[PDB]
Known about the structure:
Blueprint: E1 5-6, E2 15-19, E3 23-31, E4 34-37, E5 47-50, E6 63-72, E7 86-90, E8 115-120, E9 136-141, H1 145-151, E10 160-163, E11 180-183, E12 186-193, E13 204-208, H2 213-221
Antiparallel strand pairs: 1-9, 2-3, 2-5, 3-4, 4-7, 5-6, 6-7, 8-9, 8-11, 10-13, 11-12, 12-13
The protein binds calcium ion.
Catalytic activity: Preferential cleavage: Arg-|-Xaa, Lys-|-Xaa
Cofactor: Ca(2+)
Keywords: Calcium, Digestion, Disulfide bond, Hydrolase, Metal-binding, Protease, Secreted, Serine protease, Signal, Zymogen
Amino acid sequence: IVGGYTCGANTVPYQVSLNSGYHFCGGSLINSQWVVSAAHCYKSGIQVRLGEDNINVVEGNEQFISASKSIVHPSYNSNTLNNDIMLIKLKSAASLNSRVASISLPTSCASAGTQCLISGWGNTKSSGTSYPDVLKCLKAPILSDSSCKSAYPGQITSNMFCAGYLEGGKDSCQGDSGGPVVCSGKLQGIVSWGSGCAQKNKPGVYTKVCNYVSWIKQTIASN
Ligand SMILES: [Ca+2]
């Protein structure tokens, strides 16, 4: 997250870190046994880390649980990035409490101008790299479909939206992929892609979770 702020420990209790000997992506806890992340985050050897603030120090409140299933959307396209969503089933259920809690799925899509909270342990620099110890947060609005398509012509599908700031300085970044975009208590987005980070006229692009609620429910019910 570039241009954000330190969330505060456990203030985003649905935020998870996906770890393979290092933090590589975020995710969102949607019930005690399932996490939503990005398809492009798929790999073998995923350990889900819940309850984290400083990802480099054991502080208390962490739960480390291996992924038992990692289900990339069958129609994920690694060139267009359409359908950039994955479900992870935990080997055991997480213990839910104030510091580890699920986030609700949307019942409807969010409108342009809706304010959201985006979070992660990704890069905090627009040029160069700096990775934080603690979780970072950014408040950001959803942009209009016309502004999003103007920024990224030919590249925005119905399963994507833009959020952030066209003036530069405030965005998600590498290391944030798979993490949450929460608006009015609902998980509306997944950190997906963008051109650079926090660059003028190049907002973040996010998977439009409201299009996948039925797919998520059906996939969880059958697994
Ligand atoms: Ca920790």
